[PDB]
Amino acid sequence: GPVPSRARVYTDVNTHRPREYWDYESHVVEWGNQDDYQLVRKLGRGKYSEVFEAINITNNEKVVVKILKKKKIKREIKILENLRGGPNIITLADIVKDPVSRTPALVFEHVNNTDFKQLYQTLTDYDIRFYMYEILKALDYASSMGIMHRDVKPHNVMIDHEHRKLRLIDWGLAEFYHPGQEYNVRVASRYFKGPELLVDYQMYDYSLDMWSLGAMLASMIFRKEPFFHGHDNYDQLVRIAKVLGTEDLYDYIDKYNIELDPRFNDILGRHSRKRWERFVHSENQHLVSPEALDFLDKLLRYDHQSRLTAREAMEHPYFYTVVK
């Protein structure tokens, strides 16, 4: 069968916690006052909830209410409470029972966000570095607290560009990392899924989020949306292999004694690893530097154990120019 794997950092953080920290199933929700909040506008609907802009009439603060459509509820709540106050972690302000849905409604602080599409059109080199560093603060904190987000993507980063403020949001897919635990590979959005998910390797860890961050960075510095543009989860791996090469892919699956789905036999082909310069052109060159390429190269590795961790990434020369 497949060879096991463990995170190379923050491996045992949950084992040294009281059961209460990670045993989300046993968590007892503290309920607030639903009448404190007035819904103002529907912002959107996802697979698992509907999201509203609302006002907290007990202070006139704008808030965001997510009305949930089992146990994912307590998991998200527990993770949000565990991470509350951390750098760039969205703040859960309250939990109320919605009278119409009769499900929990999570109340979050508001962030005046700019649509990433419109906001990826304008970011300077400096601002890419600056905001990447801010996202890293959130991922280092989350992982240091034994949590993997599992859905890092531009839609889940809220940026108030005016105040240069960033929050990592939507922890509904997040999980507690337990060494040796097998996890569902049906997480993350297609274009941000790490190779571990695409080859059905279940014993993954925080390093999944670092792949997703790398895919985000590639899209930003190269002005290519998305960077790996698959038609489905299979073609998604082929798109990655056309950049990273098939030999390193086979080395990866060979290391973990993973066998590819045989349907790849007729679609994967043989591909060399490409040099990152291939993707540089007159329209994106001002966002590219040797430091950017080296940083990207160290995130986008097939082998989840070989990627930079969040803290290692923060140490990278790419961020030397960011004022701290």
UniProtKB/Swiss-Prot annotation:
An annotated GO cellular component: protein kinase CK2 complex
Listed A to Z, the keywords are: Apoptosis, ATP-binding, Biological rhythms, Cell cycle, Disease variant, Intellectual disability, Kinase, Nucleotide-binding, Nucleus, Phosphoprotein, Serine/threonine-protein kinase, Transcription, Transcription regulation, Transferase, Wnt signaling pathway
The EC category is transferase
The record describes its post-translational modification as: Phosphorylation does not directly affect casein kinase 2 activity, but may contribute to its regulation by forming binding sites for interacting proteins and/or targeting it to different compartments.
Where are the annotated segments for Interaction with beta subunit?
A: 34-39
The similarity comment for this entry is: Belongs to the protein kinase superfamily. Ser/Thr protein kinase family. CK2 subfamily.
Q: How does it assemble?
A: Heterotetramer composed of two catalytic subunits (alpha chain and/or alpha' chain) and two regulatory subunits (beta chains). The tetramer can exist as a combination of 2 alpha/2 beta, 2 alpha'/2 beta or 1 alpha/1 alpha'/2 beta subunits. Also part of a CK2-SPT16-SSRP1 complex composed of SSRP1, SUPT16H, CSNK2A1, CSNK2A2 and CSNK2B, which forms following UV irradiation. Interacts with RNPS1. Interacts with SNAI1. Interacts with PML (isoform PML-12). Interacts with CCAR2. Interacts with HIRIP3.
Role according to the record:
Catalytic subunit of a constitutively active serine/threonine-protein kinase complex that phosphorylates a large number of substrates containing acidic residues C-terminal to the phosphorylated serine or threonine. Regulates numerous cellular processes, such as cell cycle progression, apoptosis and transcription, as well as viral infection. May act as a regulatory node which integrates and coordinates numerous signals leading to an appropriate cellular response.
Name this polypeptide is given: Casein kinase II subunit alpha
- Taxonomic classification, please? Eukaryota, Metazoa, Chordata, Craniata, Vertebrata
Which gene is the coding source of this polypeptide chain?
A: CSNK2A1
